[PDB]
Amino acid sequence: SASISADIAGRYAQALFDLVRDSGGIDALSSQIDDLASAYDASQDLRDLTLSPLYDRQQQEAAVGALSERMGLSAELANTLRLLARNRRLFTLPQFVAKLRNLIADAKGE
Amino acid sequence: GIQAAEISAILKDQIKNFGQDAEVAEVGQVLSVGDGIARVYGLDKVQAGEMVEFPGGIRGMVLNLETDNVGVVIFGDDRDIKEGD
Amino acid sequence: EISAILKDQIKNFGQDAEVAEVGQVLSVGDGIARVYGLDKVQAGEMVEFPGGIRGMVLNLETDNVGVVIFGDDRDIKEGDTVKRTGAIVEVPAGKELLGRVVDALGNPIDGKGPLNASERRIADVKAPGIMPRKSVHEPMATGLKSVDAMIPVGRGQRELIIGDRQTGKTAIALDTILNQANYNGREKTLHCIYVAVGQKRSTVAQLVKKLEETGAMAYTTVVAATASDPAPMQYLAPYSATAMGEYFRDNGMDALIIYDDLSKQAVAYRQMSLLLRRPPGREAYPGDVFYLHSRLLERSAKLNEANGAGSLTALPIIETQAGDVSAYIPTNVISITDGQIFLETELFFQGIRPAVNTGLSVSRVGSAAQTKAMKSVAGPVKLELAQYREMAAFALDAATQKLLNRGARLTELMKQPQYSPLTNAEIVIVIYAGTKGYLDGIPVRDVTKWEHGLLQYLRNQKADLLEDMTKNDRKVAGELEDAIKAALDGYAKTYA
Amino acid sequence: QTGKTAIALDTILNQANYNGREADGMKTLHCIYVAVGQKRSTVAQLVKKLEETGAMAYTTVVAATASDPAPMQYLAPYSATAMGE
Amino acid sequence: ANGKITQVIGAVVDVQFDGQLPAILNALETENNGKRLVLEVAQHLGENTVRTIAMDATEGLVRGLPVKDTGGPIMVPVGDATLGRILNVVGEPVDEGGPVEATQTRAIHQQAPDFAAQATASEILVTGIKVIDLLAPYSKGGKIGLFGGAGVGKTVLIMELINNIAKVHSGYSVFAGVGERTREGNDLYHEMVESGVIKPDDLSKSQVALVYGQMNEPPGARMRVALTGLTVAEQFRDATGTDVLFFVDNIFRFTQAGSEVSALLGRIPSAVGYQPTLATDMGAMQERITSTKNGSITSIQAVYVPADDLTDPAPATTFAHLDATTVLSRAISELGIYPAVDPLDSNSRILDPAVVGEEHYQVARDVQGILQKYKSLQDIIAILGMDELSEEDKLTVARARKIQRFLSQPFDVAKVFTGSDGVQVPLEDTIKSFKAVVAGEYDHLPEAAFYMVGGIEDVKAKAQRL
Amino acid sequence: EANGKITQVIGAVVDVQFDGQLPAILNALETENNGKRLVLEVAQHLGENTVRTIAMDATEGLVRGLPVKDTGGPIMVPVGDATLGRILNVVGEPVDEGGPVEATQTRAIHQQAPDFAAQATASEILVTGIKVIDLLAPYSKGGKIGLFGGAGVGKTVLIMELINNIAKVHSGYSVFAGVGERTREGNDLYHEMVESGVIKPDDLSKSQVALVYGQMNEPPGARMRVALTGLTVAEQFRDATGTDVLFFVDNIFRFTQAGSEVSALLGRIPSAVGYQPTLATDMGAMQERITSTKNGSITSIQAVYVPADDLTDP
């Protein structure tokens, strides 16, 4: 099916999308997703991190925040990745990226 | 499957973290409700078969302890229970 | 490219897995193990668990492989190493299997050491097509008077043994195996494969003892997946045994295979299917339960001369409930096989043993492939015994009391003990005796005593006559008539 | 094969007597035969019977036969009903 | 373009395509298996992936193996070249006679004839079998179904019909073995050589084309062999404008095979675990088996009945596609009456006085009347017996039981088991014979005289032998 | 081996997660910090280092997070002559309030049925000293006997005398498995055996029978495994003391019902008349352990209930 991935993506990606929207982030937040999406297109790294079963959720929790630009992720960016991993669904990463980018577009527009 | 406790409103408090926000041990928040069944997030310490209490004062029995929710059977009219109670 | 590479060493987890030829097991339970990796494993390929247990790759899915475990799942754990063997599920085959008792995978369980197999064979091969075959024309002698006269079987045929529990289904199978010694000594052998499926272990042990103590075991292979063996092994047993039979079939030799029983194989497969969460149908069996048995029994066949003239004969056994031959599985098999031998509790509960209902039972291809001398007497026997079955609701004028006369006597001739199959030559002799009137003066209560005395008398005085009937295979010749005339006249004289 | 279709066919043919009798008052009755899941062969015989009788002039035939997609066979009855309304 | 295998589950195989997707029904060629493996596109799953059904064993497929789009549906050889040859579902020879060098290849999928092109020809087809000719006669280019439970006589009946109809047919015939016994295929093949309807030395003189996908084949193959066979017959129907015979033992196996893959295509199951597309799957196939204004197809389809339950969805849905139905009965067969035809559950759209004549028509209704009356009594006879019937019902019982046996008949093709020479009774001789019995002209003849004979003259003769 | 934690409690089904090496299926787990000893038999490995277990007692009061210990093997119960005269449960705790069952050894209730070569090629009568039986319908050593006819036809007395008699004429002991015992009738059976002497509450070695109860008020898992428990106790007398043992199973039908219930709870699609898909293997993996080996034999008398008086019922 795969369509099921979007259901979680829409939520998980919205959770953080709200915090930045009200408190303050959207503008600077766009960069975080841009840079994050750029690292995800390192095929070897991206796949190894996201899609294959690596047994330990602890092993993959810290690894996630680390692989990201220890720099280009606000508090929420670090909090989200860990929580996402903690739930055994950090694999849905692109499904959320595309979702977040759209949130910005909605916040921008015409 | 998605599973409960993977909702936009609930995932905010898991990542944001307010002051003394936790209380997931002795308290919870309704994720879903219908047909005398309330799915509840939190209540990490509630026991299988424990009689818990809704904000209306209504009683409910914890028959299902699941990974990210508790299934509560309602001893009353479910019209008095809503999402987030 | 540029903003990269630094990610590798900071993580340093996963140093190097080898996931083309190896996997790891995501989960196990309900008989099936899900495996990460095995990226180059084939559909239906054998794999090995770190416990040394075998499994078959059933499902090739996008992110995992589903494996059926040939063993107790208790022995597999999340994270266990799984390796491909490069081979589609296969078993050992050849003459080194004869006399030996093996499990469903071909492993020895008799305690006589390794199998020493030179050839191996894929278990789920498709049956030979239309051209390589030809109509059956060689007898497959059970040594059972009832069967060999009225429900005659041929080499390459599929003949069903169907009946309720405790009607003597297995016994027909055992006497048939023991019977072959007469021919296997000659220089047109018949090698035997007895497949136990779901039966009691003690039953099979007693079987092998009996085969051994008769010197019939030397040409028999026992494949055992008894009651305590896991469903997948019971599912596999028959296919494995079939492969062992095919070895003979394709090398100009003949083999007999008994599936005792397919009812239990079908429940085992149902168990596998339900745990796989496949959609249950009639009696909860999966839509492909028919196909389970079709593949199997279609491999029993008679090959033409261009393919060696070998054959594989099948005696599938089916257990009915209170004589319900319209149930799903029985109806499946009836439409697969080339006829049926029906056993009836009523006949059994009355002493008619074997409990064969000659009225219902049928065998199309086998009739034409039966010995000439038997052919000369058995036709009339069938008809007469039937007519008697048509009458006997009365139990009168003149000829009707005569039908109950022959009828009851002929019925007593069809009774037979266990472990005492009779040569075709002996069978024609005894059937000839009843059909020609030479029992009409005897008391029905003494026909068994007579027959036993008659047979020992022929074996001990007229081996030559018996030899000639066999060797020549003839009709009832005027010569054999005169010879038969003398044997019975003299015997009758010493009997009374 | 108990005679169900036959009752409906004869019923259509029967109206010929009254069809045309408009002023005399015995009101016309137009016919709609909805064929669902049948053999095209069956529908053809049918239409040939109506034509031969000269009943086809007051009959509408709505055909969703065995080879027509399931959603077409599902709609057929509602379509003809509208034509009837 | 080329695609790659993403999944394999039984006969169902998923294939991903980097570029253009192959449409539904297209045939794909799986590379690197050793032997030609065809995959038929069943659906577009999404994410540039398609679900397909394999036309042979999927053992040995590996994730990643390359797959080629042929650019069209499964195509098979058709024309006079098929006559005397044996083909499988995907057009390959299985008679060891070399390749089929056809001038035309045709897709096994096709539109069913259009309403305006339908034919409404109603003409009897005389079988020479008493029960059939009298009570539920066949129709020339009509659709005939032979229903029966396990080992009740479907195959024997269809073979006798080939022997009685295909012999003495001007045109060509197609036999389709679908999910049945391979050795029955071997017997039929050698039987047809013996009789000369197939010739291995003059393959142009052969009158029958063979297509086989028997119970040794995987579901996909069995699910399609009938289309393959019927496709060959469509050519002879149109491209020559003639009469064609289409024999199918056993069309049930078409629906059964589809039931096997459906369980793996992700359809939510319908009644008794069958595919939800059961009716439309059958419909898209059956509606091609028909007469048009261009030419006629006379089809004889053996129909298996699971557990002897005629309400099983497979058989129950088959009735709606038939012009005549011959329902075999296990209770009848067990009485020794062959063919085991239920005279009260067998019907024909041709049994109409305007089609068969009033005499034929009247005699059939009369026979069925007395048989039904006997049936209604049988319940009361089971406990109390015959002595409790009215002196009148005793009479209907007597004639009924004689009629039950007179419907029985020795077949040529059953000689091998019965030992009785086969018989063919002409329709005119059947009506008369049965009229006389109904009118009481043989109330003085013993029951046994009527059992397993041809025309009434054989009855009297037998009554003399006794 | 390791300590896990509770992740889910849904009736008699409990999911446990382990940070270390996971317990194999059929291993016994010990839930810690409860009033009573709670055992969990592993059923499946779900993945994510989490197992699914079936509970041998009630699960009310359990909390997510609670610690669980892997015993390192399947359920183990005391075996030996110290079991005679005593009443035991699935997990081998005494239920007669007579104190600890101080045996030298314990044995796992799950075990493979006798090896092919270990089977007995003989068919021998197990003489009972009971005329009707021995003459007309003799018991086979290592066989199963189906005991039909409920209460009021002297069932309990026949059971007791078979016990007594096997002890006299074979020196073999007995084991009663009450599968789904009604507590009332368990109390009465206990006192009838004491009254009849087959049990002696003073000399525990003089007692001829070991009792194992799976009371009707216990969850399905326990009622499913009790026959194994009682079977394991009896295997001790066959294999260790070469005796001819008697194994009573009242009632074999309730053994199947329990299995059906356990299978239902694990989410397995039910078969035929709603019985477990594993109906055949559940029954067969158990019954096959009852047989004649080279060393001795277990003979079994089994009360059999026939649903709807239908002998064709699965």
Ligand SMILES: Nc1ncnc2c1ncn2[C@@H]1O[C@H](COP(=O)(O)OP(=O)(O)OP(=O)(O)O)[C@@H](O)[C@H]1O
């Ligand atoms: N009153 C009648 N007299 C004579 N024949 C009749 C009568 N009614 C029906 N029949 C005949 O019965 C046959 C079947 O009837 P009908 O066409 O109604 O089929 P049906 O009951 O709709 O069954 P199906 O659903 O299979 O078509 C027809 O061929 C018709 O000639």
Ligand SMILES: Nc1ncnc2c1ncn2[C@@H]1O[C@H](COP(=O)(O)OP(=O)(O)OP(=O)(O)O)[C@@H](O)[C@H]1O
């Ligand atoms: N007309 C007949 N006369 C005498 N015997 C018959 C006749 N038809 C069938 N039989 C007997 O009944 C049995 C059934 O034969 P058949 O092969 O036709 O079974 P079937 O039900 O057609 O099988 P399938 O399901 O493969 O079509 C055979 O054993 C045959 O001897």
Ligand SMILES: Nc1ncnc2c1ncn2[C@@H]1O[C@H](COP(=O)(O)OP(=O)(O)O)[C@@H](O)[C@H]1O
């Ligand atoms: N020819 C025979 N004579 C006497 N008893 C027989 C004969 N054949 C079978 N039996 C009896 O039938 C019983 C069951 O035999 P078996 O072959 O195991 O039947 P099933 O396989 O149907 O259970 C045995 O107790 C055996 O003594």
Ligand SMILES: [Mg+2]
């Ligand atoms: Mg048996």
Ligand SMILES: [Mg+2]
């Ligand atoms: Mg109709």
Ligand SMILES: [Mg+2]
């Ligand atoms: Mg057939």
